Amino acid sequence: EDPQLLVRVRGGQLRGIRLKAPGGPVSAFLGIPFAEPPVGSRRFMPPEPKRPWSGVLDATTFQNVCYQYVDTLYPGFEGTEMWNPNRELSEDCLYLNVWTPYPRPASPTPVLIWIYGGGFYSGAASLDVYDGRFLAQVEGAVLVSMNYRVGTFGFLALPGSREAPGNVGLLDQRLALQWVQENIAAFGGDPMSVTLFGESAGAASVGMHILSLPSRSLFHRAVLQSGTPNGPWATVSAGEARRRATLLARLVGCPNDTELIACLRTRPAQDLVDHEWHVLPQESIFRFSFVPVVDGDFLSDTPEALINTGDFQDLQVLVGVVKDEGSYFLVYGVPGFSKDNESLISRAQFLAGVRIGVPQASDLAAEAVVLHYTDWLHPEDPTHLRDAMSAVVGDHNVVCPVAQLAGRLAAQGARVYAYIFEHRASTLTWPLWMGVPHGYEIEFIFGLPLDPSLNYTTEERIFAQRLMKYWTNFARTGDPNDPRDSKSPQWPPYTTAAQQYVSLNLKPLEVRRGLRAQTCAFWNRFLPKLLSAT
Amino acid sequence: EGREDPQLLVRVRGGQLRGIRLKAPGGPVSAFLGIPFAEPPVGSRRFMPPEPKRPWSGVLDATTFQNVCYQYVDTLYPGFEGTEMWNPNRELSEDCLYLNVWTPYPRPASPTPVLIWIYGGGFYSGAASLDVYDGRFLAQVEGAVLVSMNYRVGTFGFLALPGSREAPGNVGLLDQRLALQWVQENIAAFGGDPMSVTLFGESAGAASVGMHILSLPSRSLFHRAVLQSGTPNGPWATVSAGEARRRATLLARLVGCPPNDTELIACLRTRPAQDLVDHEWHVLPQESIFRFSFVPVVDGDFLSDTPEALINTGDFQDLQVLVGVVKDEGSYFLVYGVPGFSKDNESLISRAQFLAGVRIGVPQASDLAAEAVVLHYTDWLHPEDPTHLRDAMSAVVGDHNVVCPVAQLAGRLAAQGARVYAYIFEHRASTLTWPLWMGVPHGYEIEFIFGLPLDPSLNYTTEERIFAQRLMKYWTNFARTGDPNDPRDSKSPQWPPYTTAAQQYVSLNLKPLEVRRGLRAQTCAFWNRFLPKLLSAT
Ligand SMILES: C#CCCCCC[n+]1c(-c2ccccc2)c2cc(N)ccc2c2ccc(N)cc21
Ligand SMILES: [N-]=[N+]=NCCNc1c2c(nc3ccccc13)CCCC2
Ligand SMILES: [N-]=[N+]=NCCNc1c2c(nc3ccccc13)CCCC2
């Protein structure tokens, strides 16, 4: 037996696997249980800590992926199938993974905890793009990633009920954070230097841990990639969550909350998944059925209220967006859009798209969007209309909620760093018009271009090494800049006055000012006044 | 006669005239100033449409400018050329319906295209006798026959009690039409071609030109039009019959006339002209800038419908139009009524002063509409920057009142069969006495079009003299042919017509013509498409 692969955690002994990374070995501990399987009567309930086990638990393989919808739109297509589950679907999925240097760090190492995205309805920590082996091997980081319940299983709520209180998927995340505090030192990780990092729904989850006091004691720094707790999609009211849970219950034949939830608990997991999408109030894109609820408990108030009133003084935050946040969402529900054609749409198709892209918009609000995003020089130009449609979706859902978050955090004492990721992977199978879609920065941050068998360019390998250094320097120090490296140029903190952010592309860092400032003034200041007063 | 200059004796329908041999830089010109075209609109004739001037006996002396129509005289900055150059230069009188004619000397042997000037002054001021409207250069240099008329302004020209016989409104526009009718009948006596008449005007003069395009009885009196920094459409050029009735009724009250329209108008007719002028400004519904009390009324007669309705539905097939704006349309109006603004300081305003200014500059805007303006014109990188706020304030006023109504007009005329040519005048006169922050204010292109830099005693630069000659050629080439371009001179950059597809316009500055696309397109989409919907809804 290898002593480097034998770890005793509070619940007992584990056995990891020595994994080969380009530059040398890594110790991986995959499929560690952090909770009692949330099955049977425990479905929809908060996670309970995993009871101790006898003997040496085998932690050499990834465990089950949480029960979720599987995309079947483009079968065989890498573009969709890379995000699809790579392990068996099961309700028994509350497991975490730990990658550490081989041998085990001599001194306590900063911990990076990954929270995946997938609109709160999908995802797994076992995906190839979330492989912590490069960050551990190259940057000496202790990387942790956990599975958390998604869809009805993680976010169906009957607010005020004891049986289905909502936000349990976030509680699974918090339980994995408590686990890190209690056991990461056994792996050589520093529980006193924990950075959460997530993308999309994962970034929204990270934001929701910033905004929930019982989570705040479990981490020190945060990275929010292409997602935020504020915004049109990350949360729902207690009323809206109650409406959707009641409708799904009706859809599956379930007719008192105790009674309704009990019936929902008798339903096979796939019956619940089969109706998940049928509870959205309007035809929409970038809207998910079961998401965090503003319960007055995990979230004491709405993320908008909490970001405006919170004290973020002793907090360091790295935030950012990709060049084309909304391009993916268009091929899913906007007529005229396809991955297989150049998607040159007509003016009518654009006006129709704005209603789907901004489903909460009134006739007047949708017109304000249309008149803002039209190029009044070429108002009928199909390329402009196609790109404007991508921008509406990306700006509304990601860029302007990010701009609002960075602004409020900066104004309220946080130390904020903002970026725009503009590099399209050479390997990308989505059409060129989609540009840099949501999530296609992750493989660079994780350092996948370092594996020579993955067919990335040399430029991309050097670029991945750069991003790995920004992220791990941020985790170590709260600053993504290299203290050893003089002349960079430096990455300035984002401030309300200077609104500085940098561009992450193949060229050296470029400092820019104002994150889509005029456009986000429209979304963040004007449009709310349009949907409020009228 | 007998010893008189034989070139200065001309007969018209009303009788004989004697003109004057004037000196222009390049040679002599014939001027016939102070020709009467209407019966003096005095006494019982006040507020009534003009009556054609009855014939006179003997030779009428037409060697001097006549009376300026009764109007408000600016006394804001005394001694200041900036304000006093627009002030009346002849006696104020209700007896003011006279016109001026400049022609080459000797008079042309063959019929010459006619240019008819309609001055601005918010429909409350102006005169055709002003130095910047001197037709001597255009007559001498370009061989033009230039006509300019005085038309009633203020209460005298535009007070209306709509539906009444005694004060029907738009009489100031009828004075203009009467002067157009006069040109048709008599211009051939001066060597002018009645079949080639181009109207040209600036600001309220341009709104007037547009209103002649939109009124059928005027359409037979001209062939081409130039609208400089003004349009019939827009927030200030017209008022509803209801609003004109409200203002006339209030003015009556303010001067002692108790509100039957006959009784009210009769009483208004007994009031000294200065009493009416003293209260003119007190009838505006809100604290505002770029809003005038007595302006054309949508009467269902001169204007069959609103200028917006008429520009959207009209057939402009056989029409050639030259339209344009100056670099800083709104800068003047800020020193007038926006707190924080002065001609004597750099006018760096605060955010609060900007929000306050938007309410004065867009007086019809609701709380939500004013916020849409504020959020559009703010630079969200430097939202507190006083220079940006100052310039944004000028832009709101200029865009709202001139640039976007012009963009709207050019678009609708172009879409409905007209040949449109658009420009942006960007040259600030070297002689200008307004501060540099005001840039190129409203009306400061006029002296270049009229060719004042050609007079060496006026202290303009050589560049400016060459530039004036260029503009005189664009304008007269347009009057002659419906195209501002010189056919002989090809390699010289050309001026493309403005179209809905390409939205092309040119820059008129010291540098050769530069073609630009989209006349403040994103911003004017806001004023012309969005803002009205913010009214139509909340
Ligand atoms: C209420 C109202 C209208 C405000 C805008 C008009 C400003 N204005 C006035 C004036 C000032 C206060 C209340 C009402 C009117 C004015 C009042 C008098 N007595 C004489 C001249 C002017 C005046 C002259 C020119 C100009 N552009 C605005 C003016
Ligand atoms: N929303 N939803 N996303 C599910 C679709 N799968 C994809 C995901 C991400 N990016 C994608 C980009 C293109 C296509 C599918 C994608 C980011 C991480 C979450 C999952
Ligand atoms: N409107 N009104 N303005 C009264 C002041 N007179 C001026 C005029 C014009 N420009 C001016 C520019 C600055 C100051 C007064 C001006 C355009 C021609 C009509 C009159």
Swiss-Prot record, chain B:
Q: Glycosylated residues? A: 260, 345, 459
Keywords per UniProt: Cell membrane, Disulfide bond, Glycoprotein, GPI-anchor, Hydrolase, Lipoprotein, Membrane, Neurotransmitter degradation, Secreted, Serine esterase, Signal, Synapse
Annotated GO biological process: acetylcholine catabolic process; acetylcholine receptor signaling pathway; cell adhesion; osteoblast development; positive regulation of cold-induced thermogenesis; receptor internalization; regulation of receptor recycling; retina development in camera-type eye
Q: Which GO terms describe its cellular component?
A: basement membrane; cell surface; extracellular space; Golgi apparatus; neuromuscular junction; perinuclear region of cytoplasm; plasma membrane; side of membrane
Described purpose of this protein according to its UniProt entry? Terminates signal transduction at the neuromuscular junction by rapid hydrolysis of the acetylcholine released into the synaptic cleft.
This protein's species is Mus musculus
Report the GO molecular function annotations. acetylcholine binding; acetylcholinesterase activity; collagen binding; identical protein binding; laminin binding; protein homodimerization activity; serine hydrolase activity
Give a brief account of the tissues where this protein occurs: Predominates in most expressing tissues except erythrocytes where a glycophospholipid-attached form of ACHE predominates.
Additional detail:
Synapses usually contain asymmetric molecules of cholinesterase, with a collagen-like part disulfide-bonded to the catalytic part. A different, globular type of cholinesterase occurs on the outer surfaces of cell membranes, including those of erythrocytes. This is the catalytic subunit of an asymmetric or soluble form of ACHE.
Cited PANTHER family: ACETYLCHOLINESTERASE (PTHR43918:SF11)
Describe the family membership recorded for this protein in Swiss-Prot or TrEMBL. Answer: Belongs to the type-B carboxylesterase/lipase family.
- Give the matching Pfam families: AChE_tetra (PF08674), COesterase (PF00135)
Q: What's the superkingdom here? A: Eukaryota
According to its UniProt record, which residues of this chain constitute the active site? Answer: 203 (acyl-ester intermediate), 329 (charge relay system), 442 (charge relay system)
| Catalytic activity line of the entry | acetylcholine + H2O = choline + acetate + H(+)
Stated EC number for the protein is 3.1.1.7
Report the membrane topology from the UniProt record. Peripheral membrane protein
- Cystine pairs: 69-96, 257-267, 404-524
Q: Where in the cell is it found?
A: Synapse; Secreted; Cell membrane
Question: How does the annotation summarize its subunit structure?
Answer: Isoform H generates GPI-anchored dimers; disulfide linked. Isoform T generates multiple structures, ranging from monomers and dimers to collagen-tailed and hydrophobic-tailed forms, in which catalytic tetramers are associated with anchoring proteins that attach them to the basal lamina or to cell membranes. In the collagen-tailed forms, isoform T subunits are associated with a specific collagen, COLQ, which triggers the formation of isoform T tetramers, from monomers and dimers. Interacts with PRIMA1.
Q: Does the keyword Repeat apply?
A: no
Please tell me whether the keyword Lipoprotein is annotated for this protein.
yes
Q: Gene of origin?
A: Ache
Q: What is this protein called?
A: Acetylcholinesterase
